[PDB]
Design a protein around this nucleic acid. Structure first.
Ligand SMILES: O=C(O)CNC(=O)C(=O)O
Ligand SMILES: [Mn+2]
Ligand SMILES: [Zn+2]
Ligand SMILES: [Zn+2]
Ligand SMILES: [Zn+2]
Length: 418
DNA sequence: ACAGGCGCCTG
DNA sequence: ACAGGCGCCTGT
């Protein structure tokens, strides 16, 4: 749509686009309803060189941290190299520091932990391990190791639609065994949160939100939420889960992912130093040498203030499995280094530090992203809980696509009698 | 090409 | 507890 594209980064506008960074501020000021220092914009440069440890596990090289209590909205923008059009600068990440009420976040942290640690059924995903399938970033204790728990509806290759095509009364929030009371409590928590987060999605990313509500009245059984405007279809809970570098390839194109962060009780004040902390990382990006307004000194001031933490290399002892985890059916200590990624200035690794009750928005299908491993993961008392709300592709059929499935296999009855 | 996935169903 | 069915698409 311009006469100015390959490895400039993925191109999309449904989070926000404009001719320059100043135009982005006008948009974000109009969306959020405030002006000035409440909105913070950081320029990030796409390099395409993935930051990773010597074992291939997520690392951060720069940490964007909330500057002050006056900073309410954080926006990461990408200036597409060599573009002078009206989409030369696009938005790739939005972070509402004060996303949900803190009493709700305090309450959700303990309830989801206690429910999921006891009755939760673990969902094994590809990003749970590094590429050699031998890391131990989640921890090796099966009772305490970090884990992913997915709920709602999901896309299925066997139906090219919702996985509940053959499910009479599907259990969107299934827990171990058959405990309807406990599943109802978990359902109410995540349904209330989907309901609360929906208007925030619409306010700050209206174009992407509008794309996810297009077929709301055609396939309501594949949507979450209890009020009009239901952009989410599935939700995943991540308890001390180290998501290795990945894209969420099942998500619907031109959509986005909303992540609500809940943190351990030792990491709930602004001016505090927690014992451990999980970060959300964009491995293909470096930070700019300049701030939103084009000042080098403002960027250098943020680095010395801590608003942009410039990390250095590390060498830590980690565990590596003696046998890779099998696709579909002991250990030894090893040094994991990071010096190689820090010696190359163009190797990426821009992270944000999500706070208790914050809400993060990003197009997780297009942008490579990851979460750092915890020093001592423990899903019974996790450092970080992330609730990831998304809508998968081909989720626009009523009743989980039941009518299309039995119509497809009714065609087999016609082919059978031949 | 092609390995491998935020699966659930009947029997 | 199990076996076997239903098969799409993306990064590379
Ligand atoms: O937890 C986060 O911040 C990001 N989570 C994911 O990307 C995921 O679970 O797929
Ligand atoms: Mn993800
Ligand atoms: Zn790992
Ligand atoms: Zn252009
Ligand atoms: Zn469904």
């Amino acid at each position: 749509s311009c006469r100015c594209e390959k490895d400039e980064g993925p191109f999309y506008t449904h989070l926000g686009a404009g001719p320059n960074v100043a135009a982005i501020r006008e948009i974000m000021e109009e969306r959020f309803g405030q002006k000035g220092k409440a909105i913070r914009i950081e320029r990030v440069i796409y390099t395409g060189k993935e930051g990773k440890s010597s074992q291939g596990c997520p690392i951060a090289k720069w940490v964007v941290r909330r500057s002050s209590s006056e900073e309410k909205l954080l926006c990461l923008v990408r200036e597409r190299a060599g573009h002078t059009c009206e989409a030369a600068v696009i938005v790739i990440l939005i972070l509402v520091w004060e996303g949900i009420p803190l009493s709700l976040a305090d309450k959700l942290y303990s309830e989801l932990t206690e429910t999921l640690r006891k009755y939760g059924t673990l969902t094994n995903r590809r990003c749970a391990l590094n590429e050699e399938r031998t890391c131990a970033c989640q921890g090796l204790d099966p009772e305490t190791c970090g884990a992913s728990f997915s709920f709602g509806c999901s896309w299925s290759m066997y139906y090219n639609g919702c996985k509940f095509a053959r499910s009479k009364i599907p259990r969107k929030f299934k827990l171990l065994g058959d405990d309807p009371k406990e599943e109802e409590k978990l359902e109410s928590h995540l349904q209330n949160l989907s309901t609360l987060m929906a208007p925030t999605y619409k306010k700050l990313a209206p174009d992407a939100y509008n794309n996810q509500i297009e077929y709301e009245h055609r396939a309501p059984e594949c949507r979450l939420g209890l009020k009009e405007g239901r952009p989410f279809s599935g939700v995943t809970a991540c308890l001390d889960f180290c998501a290795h570098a990945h894209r969420d390839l099942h998500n619907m194109q031109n959509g986005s992912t909303l992540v609500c962060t809940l943190t351990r009780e030792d990491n709930r004040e602004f001016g505090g130093k927690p014992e451990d902390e999980q970060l959300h990382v964009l491995p293909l990006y470096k930070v700019s040498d300049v701030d939103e307004f084009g000042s080098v000194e403002a960027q250098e001031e943020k680095k010395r203030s801590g608003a942009i933490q410039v990390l250095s290399s590390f060498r830590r002892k980690v565990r590596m499995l003696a046998e890779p985890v099998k696709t579909c059916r002991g250990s030894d200590e090893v040094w994991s280094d990071s010096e190689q990624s820090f010696l190359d200035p163009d190797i990426g690794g821009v992270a944000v530090a999500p706070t208790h009750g914050s809400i993060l928005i990003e197009c997780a299908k297009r942008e490579l992203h990851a979460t750092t491993p915890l020093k001592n993961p423990n899903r019974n008392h996790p450092t970080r809980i992330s609730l990831v709300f998304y809508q998968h592709k081909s989720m626009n059929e009523p009743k989980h696509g039941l009518a299309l499935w039995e119509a497809k296999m009714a065609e087999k009855a016609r082919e059978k009698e031949e």
